[PDB]
Design a protein that fits this description.
- This is part of a larger assembly, with chains A (101 residues), B (116 residues), C (87 residues) and D (70 residues).
- Chain C has helices at 4-14, 24-43, 49-72, 74-84.
- Chain C is mainly α and 87 residues long.
- Chain D contains three helices and one strand; from the N terminus they run βααα.
- The two termini of chain D are 22 Å apart.
- Classes of the chains: A alpha+beta (101), B alpha/beta (116), C mainly alpha (87), D mainly alpha (70).
- β5 of chain A pairs antiparallel with β1 (11-12) of chain D.
- Bound molecules: magnesium ion (34 copies).
- The site of one magnesium ion has 3 residues of chain A, from loops.
- Chain C binds one RNA strand of 168 nucleotides through α2 and α3.
- It is classed as ribosome.
Chain lengths: 101, 116, 87, 70
RNA sequence: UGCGCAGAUACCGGGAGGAACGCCGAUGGCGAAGGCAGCCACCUGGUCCACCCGUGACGCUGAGGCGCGAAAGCGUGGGGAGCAAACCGGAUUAGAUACCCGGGUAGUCCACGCCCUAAACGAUGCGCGCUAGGUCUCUGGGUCUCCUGGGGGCCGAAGCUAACGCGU
């Protein structure tokens, strides 16, 4: 496997029912694709620099996973399917290159 | 018949013409003028004088609707792009702000032979 | 790709003695590993010519090493060939 | 004029999620500032470009803005 | 000429579709050449440095052969926004079979198969060894004013050249 970072931006209008739904949906997808989750950062409401889906804000999730490489692309497909999921971006993890150190 | 009293004035400045639209704050237009609206016909439309008179025609046409506060949007380069703004300032309309929103592509569409 | 695990598995299979990493045998082994990786990669991806160059050169080097082992001690050559199933 | 790296701390050039620092490297418009203005190295600018673009796809940094002047 | 009172241009909002990636951007990088610029992931080739570890001359070139090969063009099926041979107009002109302006088909894009040319240029075949330096730069390593490799530039020793110039 390799260690990746899953960024997910979804619609910032969900009540608790729907948000819990989309989130445990992301859980289920990750289970089906074999992603061991090492850490998570839920930023949530953030003002976007431009309108996305006519919506000026976005609800942000950041996952750090370790999973089989050949399953990354399929995983992203499975994620973008949901309507409420607006941005999916998976990045291979990287060493934090410092500057002005 | 509207009484907007505040809105947007768009200066479209090309080399062949300068034309001014004046809209309400939601973008919907009210009145407008251009280089051909005032008497000029040919090349004389792209001159900065015609830009002045077009700007002023449209500003006076905005007065009757009650315009006082105006935000200026500017698209394009060309003579009398500045002259239209300077006419817009002394037009009696108080100019709230001035923005350049000229659309530039990110190298998407092939230009005509003239522009390469 | 080819992880160091698989690599060392191969080197250790073909080492002429422990700690041997540069044998002609170890060489043609490793070469042929990447050769097969590349050829399977090129069954699909037929339109990828810049790697196909990589493969041509690899077969070149493999044949030069084998043509050497043939000359010096042909017995080990036959053992290597028979082990990898070549020619 | 001072340069951006000069007036800045120890920051991760690869972190696409840090908007507070990345916004320091864009112009009035959404453009990426040349190395003459950013004070970064060839490698450093090469990395900043990518992380800024990643951040732009996330809706964090803009693609372009409007100039308020002239 | 064209388009516009069947309401265009200019402005706001929604939608469709095709093509190309602004800033970064470089006098930069990569590649054997052709050539390669949004971003992510997968597969994948080359290459460079440090250690001095392994093999022990296994090397260099290379007629044939084989693979690659910008653009244009050819075949079948898609696709088709912008541009645009041919072509239709408008001008200019002595004439205009053109430069300029309004249109527009192939094509430009995709798949698969052809074609095999080029100012395909460094107009400079490949490999190795030897011959002052200085300076700018990309990228490794180091005891990191610097030293030491590998690329990309500019001056210039010896030398070469008809000359221009070339010159680790
Ligand atoms: Mg979706
Ligand atoms: Mg005109
Ligand atoms: Mg100028
Ligand atoms: Mg051009
Ligand atoms: Mg009509
Ligand atoms: Mg008519
Ligand atoms: Mg009609
Ligand atoms: Mg619109
Ligand atoms: Mg669309
Ligand atoms: Mg269509
Ligand atoms: Mg540039
Ligand atoms: Mg030794
Ligand atoms: Mg020995
Ligand atoms: Mg050769
Ligand atoms: Mg030949
Ligand atoms: Mg060809
Ligand atoms: Mg072609
Ligand atoms: Mg065709
Ligand atoms: Mg066709
Ligand atoms: Mg056209
Ligand atoms: Mg034409
Ligand atoms: Mg004609
Ligand atoms: Mg005529
Ligand atoms: Mg004449
Ligand atoms: Mg060429
Ligand atoms: Mg010669
Ligand atoms: Mg060679
Ligand atoms: Mg030098
Ligand atoms: Mg160093
Ligand atoms: Mg090179
Ligand atoms: Mg050098
Ligand atoms: Mg001399
Ligand atoms: Mg010289
Ligand atoms: Mg030497």
């Amino acid at each position: 496997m390799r260690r990746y970072e899953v960024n997910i931006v979804l619609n910032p209008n969900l009540d608790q029912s729907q948000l819990a739904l989309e989130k445990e949906i992301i859980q289920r997808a990750l289970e089906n694709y074999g992603a061991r989750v090492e850490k998570v950062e839920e930023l949530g409401l953030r003002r976007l620099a431009y309108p996305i889906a006519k919506d000026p804000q976005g609800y942000f999730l950041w996952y750090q996973v370790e999973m089989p490489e050949d399953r990354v692309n399929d995983l992203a497909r499975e994620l973008r399917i949901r309507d409420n999921v607006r941005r999916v971006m998976v990045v291979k993890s990287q060493e934090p290159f410092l500057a002005n150190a | 018949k509207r009484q907007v009293a505040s809105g947007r004035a768009y200066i479209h400045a090309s080399y062949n013409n300068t034309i001014v639209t004046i809209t309400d704050p939601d973008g919907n237009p009210i009145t407008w003028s251009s280089g051909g609206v005032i008497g000029y016909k040919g090349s004389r439309k792209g001159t900065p004088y015609a830009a002045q008179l077009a700007a002023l025609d449209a500003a006076k046409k905005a007065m009757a609707y009650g315009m006082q506060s105006v935000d200026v949007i500017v698209r394009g380069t060309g003579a009398g792009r500045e002259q239209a703004i300077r006419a817009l300032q002394a037009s009696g309309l108080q100019v709230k702000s001035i923005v350049d929103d000229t659309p530039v592509p990110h190298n998407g569409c092939r230009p005509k032979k003239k522009f390469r | 790709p080819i992880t160091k695990e698989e690599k060392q598995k191969v080197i250790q299979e073909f080492a002429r003695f422990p700690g041997d990493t540069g044998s002609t045998e170890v060489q043609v082994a490793l070469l042929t590993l990447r050769i097969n990786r590349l050829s399977e990669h090129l069954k699909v991806h037929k339109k990828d010519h810049h790697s196909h160059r990589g493969l041509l050169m690899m077969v070149g080097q493999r044949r030069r090493l084998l043509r050497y082992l043939q000359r010096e001690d042909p017995e080990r050559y036959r053992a290597l060939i028979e082990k990898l199933g070549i020619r | 004029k001072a340069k951006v790296k000069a007036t800045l701390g120890e920051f991760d050039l690869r972190d696409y999620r840090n908007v507070e620092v990345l916004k320091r490297f864009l112009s009035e418009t959404g453009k990426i500032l040349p190395r003459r203005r950013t004070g970064l190295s060839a490698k450093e600018q090469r990395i900043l470009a990518k992380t800024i673009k990643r951040a732009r796809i996330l809706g964090l940094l803009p693609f372009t803005e409007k100039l308020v002047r002239k």
